[PDB]
Amino acid sequence: CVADALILRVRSELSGLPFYWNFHCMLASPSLVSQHLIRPLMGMSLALQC
Amino acid sequence: CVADALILRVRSELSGLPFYWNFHCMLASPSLVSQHLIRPLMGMSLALQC
Amino acid sequence: PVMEELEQGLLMQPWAWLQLAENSLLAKVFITKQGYALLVSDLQQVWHEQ
C-alpha cells in the first residue's frame, strides 16, 4: 500500500521465463461495494431464514 | 442531497412550538461500513447456516 | 462495448480466497480478451480495478 491504493504483484514463470504483473487497485466506490457485498448478504440471510 | 452529503431535516411540534433539526451526514468511511454492515451480515449468514 | 460485459462477469463470479506472503484476502477476478476486472477485500476495505 502506498497512498489509498493497493499494489498486488504477481510473479510467475511461463516456459521458464519471468512474467510480472501488477494490479494497481484503488478504493472502490460506494455503489460497487454495496452491489457486491451488502445486498447479496441480506439476500442470503433472508433465504436462510426462510 | 446536493453534491455528496445528505441533509436530513426533522420538523416536529415540541408541545406546540417549532423543533427543527438538520443532520448533515457525510459519506461513511470504509471502516464504518465494514464494521456495521458487512461483517455482521456474514456472521448472521454463518449462524443461520449452522 | 466490453465494459458492461466485464462488469456483469465480475458480478456473477464467486468469491475466492487468496493467501499472500503474510496475509490473506478475498478476491473476484473476471478476465476477457478485451481486458479484466478485479475486486479484492480484507473485510475492512474494498479495492477494485477495471
From Swiss-Prot, chains A, B:
Annotated site (Leu-lock): L17
Places the protein is found: Nucleus; Chromosome
Effect seen on changing L41A: Does not affect ability to participate in V(D)J recombination
Recorded consequence of changing S34D: In XLF-Asp mutant; phospho-mimetic mutant; abolished ability to bridge DNA
Phosphoserine sites (modified residues): S34
Expression sites by tissue: Ubiquitously expressed.
Modifications made to the protein after synthesis: Phosphorylated by PRKDC at the C-terminus in response to DNA damage. Phosphorylations by PRKDC at the C-terminus of XRCC4 and NHEJ1/XLF are highly redundant and regulate ability of the XRCC4-NHEJ1/XLF subcomplex to bridge DNA. Phosphorylation does not prevent interaction with XRCC4 but disrupts ability to bridge DNA and promotes detachment from DNA.
Miscellaneous field: Was named 'Cernunnos' after the enigmatic Celtic god of hunting, the underworld and fertility.
Similarity comment: Belongs to the XRCC4-XLF family. XLF subfamily.
Clinical condition linked: Immunodeficiency 124, severe combined: A form of severe combined immunodeficiency (SCID), a genetically and clinically heterogeneous group of rare congenital disorders characterized by impairment of both humoral and cell-mediated immunity, leukopenia and low or absent antibody levels. Patients with SCID present in infancy with recurrent, persistent infections by opportunistic organisms. The common characteristic of all types of SCID is absence of T-cell-mediated cellular immunity due to a defect in T- cell development.
Annotated function: DNA repair protein involved in DNA non-homologous end joining (NHEJ); it is required for double-strand break (DSB) repair and V(D)J recombination and is also involved in telomere maintenance. Plays a key role in NHEJ by promoting the ligation of various mismatched and non-cohesive ends. Together with PAXX, collaborates with DNA polymerase lambda (POLL) to promote joining of non-cohesive DNA ends. May act in concert with XRCC5-XRCC6 (Ku) to stimulate XRCC4-mediated joining of blunt ends and several types of mismatched ends that are non-complementary or partially complementary.
Domain notes: The coiled-coil region mediates homodimerization.
Quaternary structure and partners: Homodimer; mainly exists as a homodimer when not associated with XRCC4. Interacts with XRCC4; the interaction is direct and is mediated via a head-to-head interaction between N-terminal head regions. Component of the core long-range non-homologous end joining (NHEJ) complex (also named DNA-PK complex) composed of PRKDC, LIG4, XRCC4, XRCC6/Ku70, XRCC5/Ku86 and NHEJ1/XLF. Additional component of the NHEJ complex includes PAXX.
Protein name: Non-homologous end-joining factor 1
